[PDB]
Amino acid sequence: GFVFTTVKENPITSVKNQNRAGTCWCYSSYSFLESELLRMGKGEYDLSEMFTVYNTYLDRADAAVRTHGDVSFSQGGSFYDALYGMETFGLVPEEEMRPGMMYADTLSNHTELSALTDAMVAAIAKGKLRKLQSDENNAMLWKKAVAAVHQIYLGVPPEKFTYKGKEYTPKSFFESTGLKASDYVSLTSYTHHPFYTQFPLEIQDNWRHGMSYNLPLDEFMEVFDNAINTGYTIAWGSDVSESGFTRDGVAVMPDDEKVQELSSDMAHWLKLKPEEKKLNTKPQPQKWCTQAERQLAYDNYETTDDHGMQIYGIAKDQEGNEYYMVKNSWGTNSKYNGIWYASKAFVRYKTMNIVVHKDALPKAIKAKLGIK
């Protein structure tokens, strides 16, 4: 089995549960922003994902209609959706818009909401309508309909609310946190664009076309360690549709060839049970990908924008392999109570993009990117 030893970890809030909704982009973004508020001495917060999820879906519906269905309308999103959201829509506390409150639950189940809203947006964006209807103030009626249905399943967004004795608006509550979207940068590492430049990742949930700074793979991984070692956390967008990512709290990238030599020869090893191979159950030699191997997986669909999480610490196993400590959003009913251990080889290979505070960047990388 695995025996992990924490090397360094930074403060995080409690593990949340997105339940039956594709809102990991918002839950991980808020785990990140809440750790940012803790680091900035602002205290512990519990931000409402349903508020940002609600406003993001309305903008995504508008994008689908403007592009006549090219922008897909689904539940996913990005870290930039939350950074854009707090500046544009603001923030509200968790108590003002809880998950499941409209259908007598305490956890999200957006299957019916999507079934209706996907059908509505498609009837407009991909239909035969030549002129969409509007009221005397040139307000579109279909936007009212999509907003009305979203409010029925997610709740009504508060215009004013009281939090710890003071009255706020979503905008004024965001201002009280002191957060600035300009303090955060998105980073990635690919070769189909020149290094040290900005490009929008060609993924479906990046329909806002948010930019990311492009770094070489080795410098990309240094930002991870530099952020954790200097007290920062990382918003981690990664591929999790791999055999190494298990339900038992670990994400590893084992070298299948090296494990076969330490065992049975190559012929007998290839007919040993998965329980007998122990590829994802014990510390194994990791495969350290090159920049080209990382690019191939992104080109050939083996690395997709699957899941958003938060990296907040570094740990080691009994054999000395290094891991990143990951805060998931699937509740606490797992081996490590909602915490995952992702090996550095896995993160190097399957990371789509990350968001960190600017001051988490090493001085040399800041200069190469032109960030003051």
Ligand X SMILES: *CC(=O)[C@H](CCCNC(=N)N)NC(=O)CN
Q: Which of 110, 150, 307, 357 is catalytic?
A: 307
Stretch that binds ligand X, among 55-63, 158-166, 246-254, 299-307 (CB under 6 A): 299-307
- Within residues 237-296, the interface with ligand X by CB under 6 A covers 237
Question: Should residue 307 be labelled a site residue for ligand X when binding is judged by CB under 6 A?
Answer: yes
Contact by Cβ (8 Å): 45, 93: yes
**H/E stretch holding 339:** strand 339-343
**Catalytic residue at 24?**
yes
**Catalytic residue at 307?**
yes
Q: Report the candidate in 322, 290, 315, 80 with the shortest Cα–Cα distance to residue 206.
A: 80
Binding mask of the shown chain, residues 80 to 109, with x at each position contacting a second copy by CB under 8 A:
----------------------xxx----x
Contact by Cβ (8 Å): 25, 186: no
Q: Which of 24, 55, 214, 289 is catalytic?
A: 24
Angle between helices 24-39 and 49-66 (to 10 degrees): 130
How near is the Cβ of 52 to K ion at its closest, in Å? 10
Contact by Cβ (8 Å): 84, 26: no
* Residue burial 115-139, b: 16+ Cβ < 10 Å; e: rest: eebbebbeebbeeeeeeeeeeeeee
Question: Should residue 58 be labelled a site residue for a second copy when binding is judged by CB under 8 A?
Answer: no
- The C-alpha atoms of residue 190 and residue 103 are separated, in whole angstroms, by 43
Q: Report the candidate in 317, 222, 351, 325 with the shortest Cα–Cα distance to residue 10.
A: 325
Question: Should residue 207 be labelled a site residue for a second copy when binding is judged by CB under 8 A?
Answer: yes
Q: Is 265 annotated as a binding residue?
A: yes
- Within residues 304-343, the interface with a second copy by CB under 8 A covers 333
How near is the Cβ of 268 to ligand X at its closest, in Å? 26
Contact by Cβ (8 Å): 153, 113: yes
How near is the Cβ of 77 to a second copy at its closest, in Å? 14
Q: Which residues are catalytic?
A: 24, 307, 328
Q: State the residues that interact with ligand X by CB under 6 A.
A: 18, 22-25, 74-78, 204-205, 237, 305-308
Q: State the residues that interact with a second copy by CB under 8 A.
A: 63, 66-68, 70-72, 102-104, 109, 111-112, 115-116, 118-120, 122-124, 127, 129-136, 138, 140-142, 144-145, 148-149, 152-153, 200, 202-204, 207, 209, 267, 270-271, 292, 295-296, 299-302, 333
